[PDB]
Structure 1
Amino acid sequence: ETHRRVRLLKHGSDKPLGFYIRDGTSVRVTASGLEKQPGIFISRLVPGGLAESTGLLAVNDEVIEVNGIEVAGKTLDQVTDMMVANSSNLIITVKPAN
């Protein structure tokens, strides 16, 4: 839509993904108009980790999907689990904070 597909492929690498995610509020479109709904956002990037090394992931970016699966409607424990499940070749789609 106006999103960035960022991939944290490891290819047999030790280097962790090294990022955190958190609960937030995102605004989405509806028949009622613009509504505040629960979202998932990037908390911070760990120095040395692959997430930082891309230069595309940034703090307060919204997680849209994880490897093709939209995270809307899902809790933070679920999304975390989706990401660590796919941790070898993780593909995040985000809406950049700016």
Structure 2
Amino acid sequence: ETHRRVRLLKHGSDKPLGFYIRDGTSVRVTASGLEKQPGIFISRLVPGGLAESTGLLAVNDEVIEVNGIEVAGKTLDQVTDMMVANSSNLIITVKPANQR
């Protein structure tokens, strides 16, 4: 299965998380069919940050959920709000676009 839950930030609140996110409409084949929906993707991944430190995610990768709570279908505000709340434990689940 393509997605893995990665925890970003368990030590290092001084340094940046090391990644940026982006919103785009993702069309996937779901139980509903081909459905295009708001989705968050990795926009930039920065070396030196926790994202690169885990190095398990890539910029092409698509975000599924954060801390156990789905972001697939939420608004960019809602998902960022997750991340701000999950600042002590940012767990993001992504799937690579080029599969795993």
The TM tier, using the shorter chain, reads: 0.7 to 0.9
Summarize deviations over 1:3-24 as a string: whole Å, max 9, x none.
1111113236533212111111
Residue 86 of structure 1 deviates from its aligned partner by 0.6
- Alignment partners' CA distance in 2, 1:12 and 1:44: 19
Residue 29 of structure 1: how far off its partner (Å) = 3.3
What secondary structure is seen at the aligned counterpart in 1 of 2:27? strand
Question: With structure 2 as the length reference, what TM-score do the two structures score?
Answer: 0.83
TM-score by length of 1: 0.85
Change (3 A) 1:30 1:7: closer
Q: Distance in 2 between matches of 1:5 and 1:68?
A: 9
Contact 1:17–1:87 (Cα < 8 Å) also in 2: no
Q: Structure 2 regions of 5+ residues with no counterpart?
A: none
1:13 counterpart SS class: coil
Contact 1:66 1:92 in 2 (8 A): yes
Aligned Cα root-mean-square deviation (Å): 1.9
Aligned length: 98
- Decide whether aligned partners of structure 1 residues 48 and 31 sit closer, same or farther in structure 2, where only a CA change above 3 A counts: closer
Q: Secondary structure at the match of 1:64?
A: strand
Please list the CA deviations of residues 31-90 of structure 1 after superposition, one character each: whole Å capped at 9, or x if unmatched: 652122121110001231111111111102111000010112211111111112111211
8 Å Cα contact 2:2/2:95 also seen in 1: yes
Inter-CA distance 63–10: structure 2 relative to 1 (3 Å threshold): same
What is the percentage of aligned positions where both structures have the same residue? 100
* Residues 21 and 12 (structure 1), Cα distance of their counterparts in 2 relative to 1, 3 Å cut: closer
